[PDB]
Design a protein around this ligand. Structure first.
Ligand SMILES: CCCCCCCCCCCCCCCCCC(=O)OC[C@H](CO[C@@H]1O[C@H](CO[C@H]2O[C@H](CO)[C@H](O)[C@H](O)[C@H]2O)[C@H](O)[C@H](O)[C@H]1O)OC(=O)CCCCCCCCCCCCCCCCC
Ligand code: CLA
Ligand code: CLA
Ligand code: CLA
Ligand code: CLA
Ligand code: CLA
Ligand code: CLA
Ligand code: CLA
Ligand SMILES: CC1=C(/C=C/C(C)=C/C=C/C(C)=C/C=C/C=C(C)/C=C/C=C(C)/C=C/C2=C(C)CCCC2(C)C)C(C)(C)CCC1
Ligand SMILES: CC1=C(/C=C/C(C)=C/C=C/C(C)=C/C=C/C=C(C)/C=C/C=C(C)/C=C/C2=C(C)CCCC2(C)C)C(C)(C)CCC1
Ligand SMILES: CCCCCCCCCCCCO[C@H]1O[C@H](CO)[C@@H](O[C@H]2O[C@H](CO)[C@@H](O)[C@H](O)[C@H]2O)[C@H](O)[C@H]1O
Lengths: 94, 733, 196, 68, 80, 158
């Protein structure tokens, strides 16, 4: 009913789920999925614009939580918040 | 690099006229050019795509400029049901005075052409109102067309050429094209609808000089940020609204009404806005699936390598398909062309039943033209898909790296596949032709009560499920007390049900036994065309009659008269045979559409319902009856405005027939004849002082097949277009 | 031979010393042992939930509180408020019910699959066997058999509940039993099987 | 159909159909073959002439009997 | 000019050499078959691409193969 | 009734069509002597027409707004005489023909030149195989069970 509370609560719950619940499964499935072409990654094959950025990925968090993860779970938080905030006044939607 | 063509030494040393023809025909086959590498192929393709964009922008800008300069858009805006829009002026010095008088129409001061493309309705629905707006649009498109050429020139210089590994980054391209090209474009168009077109449909004029001050909504973006989105729907337009005016206007921008606008007989604008907003959201979400540089995203190769049925019935599954697809451009072109053909047909089917442009539903000739045009384009695209798919098997397919996956097993059970397709075609042909002939005989002997008339019960049942009440079925949306009826009872069911049960529009037309028969004929066409193309593709690499076919390439004349004779054995020839069946099938589809609608618009449905069950009905009541005006465009007593169409009609019949000459008579007859003419010229005084420099020869075998099929297709199209336009516009305008 | 079908040969991959093996596998879905172990675990997990659910379907209907289907109706009413034993639930709001359930159950079920021991995967110890009954392996296996049997019998009963609910909308499980006891020779499955 | 095409396509199709007949023990000893090139041309011109001439025959006879 | 190739399934029957209308082929000694000879194609600049040689060959599949290539005055059989 | 259709025994358009056809026949009948052969032929045609309309009416067919009978093939048990029973008859006869053809081909393939027996039929042999199509559904089923109907994929070749 109050957006400034609903959005904060939804974002907090999504971040908690990301950092403490599904962290291991995501970080172990990611290691097995690296795009490649003819047995070599895109940057190894010659694409100079396919280099993986290194500055933004490092973090001092104990488990490796970073900014990209922050944005990935924060987006889910805002989307779910505005889903609940819309089917309250009058919304008959899935 | 010696002479034309510079890209082929084999053609450049040819001393005959064959050098010129073939030089034109292989210009855009970059893979076959001398000393070509993999990287230059991609770079040249990129430049050519920029060229296509420049040409498209020029075409659209020309349309806008000519309409603004010589049209009656402003006059048409005020009386859209009785004024005929103007395409462009006519300046022909061959004209006589009666033609000058006859072609002066639409309120113009000179002879003109009437437009049937529907651009007036389209441009009026999106908020354009004056000739100045059209001029600015044409100039802007002229700027974009120049931008395309400049970019194409720039990306072809050594400093600015992308590398080969750039063109093969599949995940990044998919992300950018899903998120940005589809979703963000939809967002921008929704913004245009909210800021410009919807206000224009209420008497408010927003342009580039005042759009900042005016608010699209009285309460602004407050409801969006706070989440009270339902405020954007609560005051929709009235049922007595006049489209260009403020009488009955509302204030909503996003609705879920359904049905049609009672005056314009088209979809509500707020529904289109909400639609594009939701679609934009879906694409924006879809575009985050794949991994580029940030440690998140799926991998396509790893997705393919995993989905393998553990029972072993699909061999090794999808293992190895990533490289097979990503290293072959023909595979990619085939997938893209197939998808585009399917959606071209879907566009054609959905634009006649659910019109989106104001006052276009009443313009019968325009609707007919659009449906026919897009169905023929779809047919050509569908044939091309299988053509480039067959090219894949010869040029790029590598057996060793596809061992025991689905693609190899397709080649493994080709006999079973082809035989079952043949059985389906035989069954449909035998029993459909038999029923038609039985009904014809019953009509001839004067006993119409002995016909075989099968009611299309399944389709009527589905129509009842969608809300139609004609057939007395009580199921789903046609029932009053059910979960499906209750769930949508307040959202969109009222307008939808009002639209479906109105029998003046073309939303779920009433159907009968004639519809049953013609639908099974259309199914026959689809199955047989697919048989021809699939047999071409799967036998491309070889068969029992020619086990080493892949060494000879995609297109070659034959393998000689030995082993029984081998005429028309290549895959190119299978494509050539399939194009005829494609034209046949699309002809059946468009004939059926046109006759059903022409009897709908005259208020005489029983004519179709009774004459369509036997073939003499089609010949007499559709073809013969609807030609009478067309063939009187000019006669011994004078001419009228249909004369051009009448002329075009005959033009078509000519080109068609000329094609027969190339298809029936073959090369050896013509070469012997040509030798005699060469002898005659070399022996004639006052004329042997002139010499040829390319030795004349008869056309090649494959070239003749191509030229004959081209004359056939051009004649086909021009004849039907003349008949359709003349027959409809003579009755309705 | 096969115990489920007397006079029938046993499957090649079956006939092992499993808790509940009767040689029944017509489709041969258990050829790979790595799939077979996870199928055993999945069977145990379905069995336990069905056994726990049967009383939860039979008790409220028998206490005159509404059948298992009508208890979900208040969630479809916009002003619907939950009730438990006739006492309204203050926090019966749908969003928090749908939120905390997901949030708690996700963690509770994510914890259980981090275990790597396959034998301990099906049957853990610690805080799940407070009284303790694994002291005797023979009686342990006997109890395992007597658990899997009742679990299969409970899954059958739940599927029967669903089908009988679909056959008679608006009714409950024990209502059908009462109707059957009222007219045994006239109220049976014959009417649905042979429809009028 | 006979005039516009060639026999290699049709023999290739017959191979697939013969596979299916072999599957069920009904492949004839008299091995099926497509028509020779000359026979294709002959069948084509024969059916073209028969159809055209008969069309005109029916047209003439109905017209002159009804109106004459 | 067309390309003509001979494969080692040849039985040295000599029918292809007799069938050629412009003298492209000839027989040479060999030790791989019972006839102790094999075909050869030393004069392919005079080939017209008629494929009579393929029509004459008895082995399955063929032992002489013709691939049509770039056209010349000789290969188009032009007398003018 | 079904799909908004009307039974032909209660359709006004059906009776109108019958009356129109009978009147058209009677107009021709009124051109000849009562005892001449053409008059008798026309009278026989009229009686046949009346019988046809009566039988269509009383066999339970349905008629549309045009006044012509329509067939129902969705499975409804009130119309099995329209498609299902004749379909069973068609399948039985077709199975008989195919079964006797296959059995002749199998019985004749064991000779020195089987093709000679395909352009010249051995009527003595065929007259012993023709009556056996009477029970083709049983024979084909038993042959399918024992694996004698189909050839394995590995064995298929010229
Ligand atoms: C307005 C008119 C604009 C065009 C005017 C000029 C037309 C001239 C056409 C001549 C075609 C000659 C031919 O025989 O050309 C043959 C060519 C290609 O043959 C090539 O021929 C080559 C010949 O070798 C030569 O070329 C090779 C490649 O360079 C090598 O260099 C080699 O050494 C050298 O000898 C190779 O064999 C290639 O493998 C082989 O592919 O075929 C092809 O172009 C076939 C593919 C083209 C598209 C086919 C589908 C589209 C048409 C369907 C119907 C359209 C209906 C339209 C309706 C509209 C209604 C409004
Ligand atoms: C930002 C985009 C946007 C906006 C501003 C609106 C706004 C509106 N929508 Mg629409 N809608 C959208 C996107 C949007 N919609 C999308 C992406 C979908 C597809 C699922 C829908 C499906 C939809 C339905 C089915 C309905 C509405 C309705 C409404 C109205 C009432 C509020 C509501 O229930 O919202 C809808 C809220 C959502 C769909 C929540 C989305 C949750 C996430 C983001 C996606 C799904 C998970 C309001 C005018 C209702 C109405 O009565 O309109 C007249 C209604 O019945 N919308
Ligand atoms: C967000 C970034 C972005 C964007 C906007 C584009 C845009 C484009 N790229 Mg891509 N590209 C990108 C990033 C991007 N790219 C990246 C990062 C890479 C490197 C990995 C590439 C690599 C790349 C290559 C190699 C090529 C392109 C090409 C193209 C063009 C495709 C042709 C076209 O115009 O289709 C237009 C398509 C649409 C508007 C969407 C389809 C809409 C369908 C048909 C439905 C329509 C529905 C609608 C209601 C109908 C209205 C009809 C109207 C009359 C009313 C297009 C301009 C091609 C090209 O032509 O380049 C010049 C090309 O060859 N791109
Ligand atoms: C996005 C679309 C697309 C693209 C990029 C390509 C690209 C390519 N195609 Mg593919 N193709 C497409 C669509 C496409 N195709 C479609 C829709 C079809 C089905 C009709 C085909 C069918 C096809 C075939 C059958 C073949 C190709 C081939 C080719 C290559 C070019 C050949 C060339 O230079 O022709 C040069 C162009 C011409 C000679 C012009 C031909 C014009 C025809 C005859 C009709 C012209 C009539 C004219 C308009 C009359 C006007 C009269 C007036 C009074 C109105 C190239 C790889 C060839 C290939 O790769 O071979 C290995 C090849 O053989 N394509
Ligand atoms: C009107 C012209 C016409 C007709 C009727 C056909 C018919 C057929 N074509 Mg052909 N075709 C045509 C034009 C036509 N084609 C043209 C112009 C082309 C472009 C070159 C092609 C190219 C083409 C290809 C490439 C293929 C076909 C195929 C087929 C078959 C499709 C399946 C089918 O309907 O089986 C039902 C059969 C029929 C409707 C044929 C007529 C049967 C008659 C009516 C039976 C009764 C005969 C009567 C008792 C005999 C009395 C005469 C005498 C004894 C006194 C069928 C035999 C496909 C095929 O072979 O599929 C298996 C196929 O692959 N056609
Ligand atoms: C979902 C629950 C479930 C699961 C995962 C299993 C799994 C297993 N069972 Mg168990 N079983 C179950 C339910 C289940 N069972 C029920 C309800 C009964 C009583 C009827 C039994 C009775 C039973 C016996 C008697 C035996 C097993 C055995 C097995 C093992 C080998 C068979 C196999 O591979 O199954 C894998 C199963 C699946 C992958 C599920 C496939 C489901 C399909 C796709 C749809 C089924 C729809 C259903 C038939 C609809 C009608 C239901 C209605 C009749 C009630 C395996 C560990 C054998 C064994 O050796 O155990 C150690 C053995 O002897 N089961
Ligand atoms: C599989 C486990 C399971 C699940 C998911 C449910 C779910 C439910 N039960 Mg049931 N129940 C179960 C097992 C289960 N039960 C068992 C094993 C018993 C026997 C002890 C019961 C006895 C029981 C009773 C007596 C009642 C329910 C009720 C309910 C409903 C309200 C729950 C609530 O508001 O809790 C809120 C939170 C807490 C209680 C904590 C809900 C549909 C109520 C109902 O349906 O009322 C109409 C109700 O009255 N259950
Ligand atoms: C996909 C389409 C489809 C299919 C496959 C079927 C199949 C069937 N329908 Mg039909 N049906 C359909 C659509 C379909 N129907 C639709 C859309 C409707 C609504 C208009 C109906 C209405 C309908 C009715 C009213 C009846 C059937 C019946 C039947 C059965 C008759 C078989 C029989 O006894 O043969 C006999 C064969 C031998 C003796 C051998 C069969 C299972 C009949 C039945 O008894 O079904 C259980 C029946 O009474 N159908
Ligand atoms: C614990 C901790 C900490 C803290 C942290 C934090 C506090 C964080 C936060 C975070 C956050 C807080 C995040 C967020 C994010 C977000 C996002 C990412 C969002 C997104 C969004 C979106 C995307 C949207 C969209 C949209 C629109 C635009 C419109 C309407 C619709 C929608 C809504 C859909 C620290 C550091 C001290 C360290 C220690 C520990
Ligand atoms: C040869 C070849 C090729 C080609 C291919 C092709 C050309 C294909 C095509 C294909 C096609 C052309 C297909 C199509 C399909 C379709 C489909 C599959 C559809 C579906 C649908 C659906 C499923 C729907 C549903 C529904 C409905 C109806 C209603 C509403 C709801 C829903 C949505 C559910 C390639 C390139 C690969 C390469 C290799 C070789
Ligand atoms: C209706 C719902 C009612 C819920 C009631 C509350 C249930 C709470 C259960 C909490 C269980 C916590 O689990 C706690 O004991 C388990 C068993 O010793 C430990 O688990 C550990 O021991 C297991 C048994 O030897 C082995 O598989 C492993 O060594 C390890 O998983 C957990 O590391 C510990 O955290």
């Amino acid at each position: 009913l109050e957006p400034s509370v609903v959005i904060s609560l939804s974002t907090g719950l999504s971040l908690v789920l990301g950092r403490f619940v599904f962290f291991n499964f995501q970080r172990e499935n990611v290691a097995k999925q690296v795009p490649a072409q003819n047995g070599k990654t895109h940057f190894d094959a010659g694409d100079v614009r396919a280099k993986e950025f290194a500055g933004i990925l490092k973090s001092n968090d104990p488990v490796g939580f970073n900014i990209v993860d922050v944005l990935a779970w924060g987006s889910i938080g805002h989307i779910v918040a505005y889903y609940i905030l819309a089917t309250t006044s009058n919304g008959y939607d899935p | 690099e010696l002479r034309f063509p510079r890209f082929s030494q084999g053609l450049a040393q040819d001393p005959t006229t064959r050098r010129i023809w073939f030089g034109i025909a292989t210009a855009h086959d970059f893979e076959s050019h001398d000393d070509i590498t993999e990287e230059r192929l991609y770079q040249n393709i990129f430049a050519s795509h920029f060229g296509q964009l420049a040409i498209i922008f020029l075409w659209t800008s020309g349309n806008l400029f000519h309409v603004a300069w010589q049209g009656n858009f402003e006059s048409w805006i005020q009386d859209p049901l009785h004024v005929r829009p103007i395409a462009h002026a006519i300046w022909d010095p061959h004209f006589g005075q009666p033609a000058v008088e006859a072609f002066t129409r639409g309120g113009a001061a000179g002879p003109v052409n009437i437009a049937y493309s529907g651009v007036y309705q389209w441009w009026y629905t999106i908020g354009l109102r004056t000739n100045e707006d059209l001029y600015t649009g044409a100039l802007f498109l002229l700027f974009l067309s120049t931008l395309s050429l400049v970019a194409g020139w720039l990306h072809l210089q050594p400093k600015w050429k992308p590398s080969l590994s750039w063109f093969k980054n599949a995940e990044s391209r998919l992300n950018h094209h899903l998120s940005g090209l589809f979703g963000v474009s939809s967002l921008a168009w929704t913004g245009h609808l909210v800021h410009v077109a919807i206000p224009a449909s209420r008497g408010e004029y927003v342009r580039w000089n005042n759009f900042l001050d005016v608010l699209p909504y009285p309460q602004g973006l407050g409801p969006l940020l706070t989440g009270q989105w339902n405020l954007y729907a609560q005051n929709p337009d009235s049922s007595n609204h006049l489209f260009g005016t403020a009488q009955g206007a509302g204030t909503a921008i996003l609705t879920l009404l359904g049905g049609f606008h009672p005056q314009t007989q088209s979809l509500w604008l707020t529904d289109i806005a909400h639609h594009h907003l939701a679609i934009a959201f879906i694409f924006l979400i879809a575009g985050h699936m794949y991994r580029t540089n940030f440690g998140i995203g799926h991998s396509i190769k790893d997705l393919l390598e995993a989905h393998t049925p553990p029972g072993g019935r699909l061999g090794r599954g999808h293992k190895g398909l990533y490289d097979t697809i990503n290293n072959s451009i023909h595979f990619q072109l085939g997938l893209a062309l197939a998808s585009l053909g399917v959606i071209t047909s879907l566009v054609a089917q959905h634009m006649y039943s659910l019109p989106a442009y104001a006052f276009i539903a009443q313009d019968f000739t325009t609707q007919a033209a659009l449906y026919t045009h897009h169905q023929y384009i779809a047919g050509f695209i569908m044939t091309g898909a299988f053509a480039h798919g067959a090219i894949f098997f010869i040029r790029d397919y590598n057996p060793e790296q596809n061992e025991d996956n689905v693609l190899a097993r397709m080649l493994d059970h080709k006999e079973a596949i082809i035989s079952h397709l043949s059985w389906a075609s035989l069954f449909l042909g035998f029993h459909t032709l038999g029923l038609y002939v039985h009904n014809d005989v019953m009509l001839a002997f004067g006993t119409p009560e002995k016909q075989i008339l099968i009611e299309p019960i399944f389709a009527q049942w589905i129509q009842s499920a969608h809300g139609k009440t004609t057939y007395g079925f009580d199921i789903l949306l046609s029932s009053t007390n059910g979960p499906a009826f209750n769930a949508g009872r307040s959202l969109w069911l009222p307008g939808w049900l009002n639209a479906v049960n109105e029998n003046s529009n073309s939303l779920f037309l009433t159907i009968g036994p004639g519809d049953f028969l013609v639908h099974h004929a259309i199914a026959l066409g689809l199955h047989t065309t697919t048989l021809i193309l699939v047999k071409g593709a799967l036998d491309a690499r070889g068969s029992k009659l020619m086990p080493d076919k892949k060494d000879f390439g995609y297109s070659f004349p034959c393998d000689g008269p030995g082993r029984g004779g081998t005429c028309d054995i290549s895959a190119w020839d299978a494509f050539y045979l399939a194009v005829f069946w494609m034209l046949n099938t699309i002809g059946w589809v468009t004939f059926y559409w046109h006759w059903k609608h022409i009897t709908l618009w005259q208020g005489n449905v029983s004519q179709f319902n009774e004459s369509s069950t036997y073939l003499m009905g089609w010949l007499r009541d559709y073809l013969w009856l609807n030609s009478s005006q067309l063939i009187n465009g000019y006669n011994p007593f004078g001419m009228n405005s249909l004369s051009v169409w009448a002329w075009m009609f005959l033009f078509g019949h000519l080109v068609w027939a000329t094609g027969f000459m190339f298809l029936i008579s073959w090369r050896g007859y013509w070469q012997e004849l040509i030798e005699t003419l060469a002898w005659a010229h070399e022996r004639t005084p006052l004329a042997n002082l002139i010499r040829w420099r390319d030795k004349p020869v008869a056309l090649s075998i494959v070239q003749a097949r191509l030229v004959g099929l081209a004359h056939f297709s051009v004649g086909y199209i021009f004849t039907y277009a003349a008949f359709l336009i003349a027959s409809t516009s003579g009755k309705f305008g | 031979s096969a115990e489920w079908f007397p006079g029938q040969p046993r499957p090649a991959h079956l006939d092992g010393s499993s808790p509940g093996d009767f040689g029944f596998d017509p489709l041969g879905l258990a050829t790979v042992p790595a799939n077979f172990e996870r199928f055993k675990e999945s069977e145990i997990y379905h069995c336990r939930w069905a056994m726990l659910a049967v009383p939860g379907v039979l008790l409220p209907e028998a206490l005159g509180l509404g059948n298992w289907v009508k208890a979900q109706e208040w969630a479809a009413i916009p002003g619907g408020q939950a009730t438990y034993l006739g006492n309204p639930v203050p926090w019966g709001n749908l969003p928090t019910i749908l939120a905390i359930e997901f949030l708690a159950i996700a963690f509770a079920e994510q914890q259980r699959t981090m275990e790597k021991d396959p034998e301990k995967k099906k049957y853990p110890g610690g805080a799940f066997d407070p009284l303790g009954f694994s002291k005797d392996p023979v009686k342990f296996e006997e109890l395992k058999l007597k658990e899997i049997k009742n679990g299969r019998l409970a899954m059958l009963a739940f599927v029967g509940f669903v089908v009988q609910q679909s056959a008679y909308p608006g009714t409950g499980p024990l209502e059908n039993l009462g109707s059957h006891l009222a007219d045994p020779w006239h109220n049976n499955i014959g009417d649905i099987v042979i429809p009028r | 159909m006979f005039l516009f095409s060639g026999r290699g396509y049709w023999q290739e199709l017959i191979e697939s159909i013969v596979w299916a007949h072999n599957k069920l023990k009904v492949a004839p000893a008299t091995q099926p073959r497509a028509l020779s090139i000359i026979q294709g041309r002959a069948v084509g011109v024969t059916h073209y002439l028969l159809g055209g001439i008969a069309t005109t025959w029916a047209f003439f006879l109905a017209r002159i009997i009804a109106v004459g | 000019s067309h390309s003509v190739k001979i494969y080692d399934t040849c039985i040295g029957c000599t029918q292809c050499v007799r069938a050629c209308p412009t003298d492209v082929l000839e027989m040479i000694p060999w030790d791989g078959c019972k006839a102790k000879q094999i075909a050869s194609a030393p004069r392919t600049e005079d080939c017209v691409g008629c494929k009579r040689c393929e029509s004459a060959c008895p082995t399955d599949f063929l032992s002489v193969r013709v691939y049509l290539g770039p056209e010349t005055t000789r290969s188009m059989a032009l007398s003018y | 009734d079904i799909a908004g259709l009307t039974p032909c025994k209660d359709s006004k358009a059906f009776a109108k069509r019958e009356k129109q056809s009978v009147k058209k026949l009677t107009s021709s009948l009124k051109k000849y002597a009562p005892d001449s052969a053409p008059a008798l032929a026309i009278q026989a045609t009229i009686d046949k027409t009346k019988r046809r309309f009566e039988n269509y009416g009383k066999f339970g067919l349905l008629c549309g707004s045009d006044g012509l009978p329509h067939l129902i093939v969705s499975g409804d048990q009130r119309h099995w005489g329209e498609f299902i029973t004749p379909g069973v008859l068609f399948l039985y006869i077709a199975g008989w023909i195919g079964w006797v053809g296959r059995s002749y081909l199998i019985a004749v393939s064991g000779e020195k030149k089987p093709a000679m027996r395909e352009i010249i039929i051995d009527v003595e042999l065929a007259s012993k195989i023709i009556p056996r199509g009477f029970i083709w559904p049983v024979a084909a089923y038993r042959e399918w069970i024992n694996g004698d109907l189909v050839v394995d994929d590995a064995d298929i070749g010229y």
